[PDB]
Amino acid sequence: ANWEHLLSLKRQGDTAKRLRIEQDDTRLGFEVDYDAIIFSAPFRSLQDKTQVIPLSKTDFVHTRLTHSLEVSVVGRSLGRMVGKKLLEKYPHLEQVYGYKFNDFGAIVAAAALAHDIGNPPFGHSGEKAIGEFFKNGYGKRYKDSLTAKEYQDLIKFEGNANGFKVLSQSKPGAQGGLRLSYATLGAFMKYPKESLPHKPSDHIADKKYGFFQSERALFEDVAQELGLLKRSTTDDVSWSRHPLAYLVEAADDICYTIIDFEDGINLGLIPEEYALEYMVKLVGQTIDRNKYNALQETSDRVSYLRALAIGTLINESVDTFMKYEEEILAGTFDQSLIDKSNYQAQITDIINLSIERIYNSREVIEKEIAGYEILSTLLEARCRALDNNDTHYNQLIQQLLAPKSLYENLIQICAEVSTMTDGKALRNYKKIKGL
C-alpha cells in the first residue's frame, strides 16, 4: 500500500483527479468533510438521542452527540501527532504531494465524529433487537426471498454498516450522500468486509462487518481508489484496513473506556472511592498532586483524572501506531492499538467495573428490555405495511412513518427505524399501540 493513494481526496462521482497540492487551504477536502458532518441532518439528530447509560438529575451524563464530539476531538489529536511523524518518515508526501500534518487530524476527526451516526437506539442491545426481528420474529418470513448475505445483513444488523449507508446513500438531489473524501471513508471503515463469512478469524477487523450488500459496490470503488490490499479473492470480499482506521478505532476505544468511567462516577453508579485507585497508574507521571487535592468537587477531580488518562493513552497509541506502521501498511497487523497498551490491565479493570456497575445496572437492563419492544413494534408496523400496502390501516402507517427490490426495502426500513430520534420513535410507537 502507498500513502499517496491512501490519502485520496476523491468524492463520489468525480470526473477528474483532485491533487493535494492544488487544494485551497481554506477549503481543504478533509476539513470540508468535518463541517459537512456537523451540519448534516443525521449528526444533528444525535442531539435527541441518548446513550444506554441512565440520565442523572444532578450530574452531567453524555448524550450521543456530546460523545461523538469528544471522540472526534481525541481523534484529531491522534491524527495530528501521527501525521507529523508520518511526514517525517515519508518527507516526499509533503515535498512532492503537498500533504500537511493537519490533513491526518482532519481525516481521523471526521471519521471519528461520524462513527455513531448510523447506530440504532439502545446500544448494542438495539442492534440485537433488530436482528432478532428477522431471525425469529415477523421478519423471519423473508429468509427464503433473500440471499444468504442479504439475510445476514438483517439478522446481524450492524450500526457500523448503517453508518456507512447514512454517509454515502444517494437520494434524489443528493447523489453520494455527504460525499466525503475517500480517505475519510477509508478511515471510517473499521471492518472492511461483508456480512459473510461470519467472523472468519479472530482479527479485530473480522469481528463485525462494515457494509451492507446495498453498499458493497460503493465500498469497492473506495477500496479500489485507496489501493486497499485485497484480503480474500472469493465472491466474499474483504480488504486490509486503511491505516488511519486504527486511529479512529483508538479514539473510540480510549473514550469508551475513560469517559464511561467518568459518567459512571458522576451518576453514582461507580463509588467515587474507586476513581483514583483505577486511574493512578494511568495518570501518575503527569498529575499535579497539589492541584488534585485542592479540587473540592468530585466531578472536577474526576474530569482532571479523565483528561490526564486520555492524554496518556493518546501518546501511547501514537507510538504504537508508528512502531507497527509498516505492518499496518502491509495488512499484517492483526490487533488493535489499545490491545498493545502497557496499561492493558488497568484498561481491562476499568472496562469490567463499567460492565458491572453501569451496563449490568438495573436502569440499563430495563431500558434495553423496553427498547426491544419499541424497535420490534416499529419494524413490524413497517413490514406489515410493506407486505400489504393496500389496506386503509397500512396506508395510515405509511403516511405516519414513511410519507425497489424486497431487500432494498427491508434494509431501508432498518436504516430508517435505526436513525429515528428517541422522541419521534417513542411517539410513533405509542400511537401504534394506542398509549
Give me the residues that bind its own copies (CB under 8 A), please: 25-26, 34-35, 38-39, 41, 44-45, 47-48, 57-58, 60, 62-63, 65-66, 69-70, 73, 77, 80-81, 84, 101-102, 171-174, 291-296, 299-300, 303, 306-307, 423-424, 427
Q: How far is the CB of 411 from its own copies (least distance, A)?
A: 19
Q: What is the rounded radius of gyration, in angstroms, for the C-alpha atoms of the chain?
A: 22
Select 150 or 262, whichever has its Cβ closest to its own copies: 262
Amino acid at 16: A
Distance in angstroms (rounded) separating the CA atoms of residues 194 and 214: 10
> What is residue 56's DSSP assignment?
-
Distance in angstroms (rounded) separating the CA atoms of residues 370 and 435: 15
Q: How far is the CB of 263 from its own copies (least distance, A)?
A: 11
Select 101 or 151, whichever has its Cβ closest to its own copies: 101
Cell triple for 43: 449528526
Exposure string of 274-309, with b = 16+ CB inside 10 Å and e = fewer, is bbeebbeebbeeebeeeeeeeeeeeeebbbbbbebb
- Greatest Cα-to-Cα distance within the chain, rounded to the nearest angstrom: 72
Q: How far is the CB of 63 from its own copies (least distance, A)?
A: 6
Burial (Cβ within 10 Å: 0-12, 13-18, ≥19) of residue 144: exposed
Select 31 or 225, whichever has its Cβ closest to its own copies: 31
Q: How far is the CB of 20 from its own copies (least distance, A)?
A: 16
Distance in angstroms (rounded) separating the CA atoms of residues 434 and 44: 29
> What is residue 171's DSSP assignment?
B
Element (H, E) at 338: none
Q: How far is the CB of 278 from its own copies (least distance, A)?
A: 19
Select 220 or 319, whichever has its Cβ closest to its own copies: 319
Cell triple for 113: 465524529
154 φ/ψ angles, rounded to the nearest 5 degrees? -85, -50
Q: How far is the CB of 294 from its own copies (least distance, A)?
A: 3
Q: How far is the CB of 130 from its own copies (least distance, A)?
A: 23
Select 26 or 285, whichever has its Cβ closest to its own copies: 26
Select 130 or 180, whichever has its Cβ closest to its own copies: 180
Select 45 or 214, whichever has its Cβ closest to its own copies: 45
Q: How far is the CB of 67 from its own copies (least distance, A)?
A: 10
Distance in angstroms (rounded) separating the CA atoms of residues 192 and 203: 12
Distance in angstroms (rounded) separating the CA atoms of residues 345 and 343: 5
Q: Measuring CA to CA, which residue among 189, 3, 183 is closest to residue 105?
A: 183
Select 272 or 339, whichever has its Cβ closest to its own copies: 272
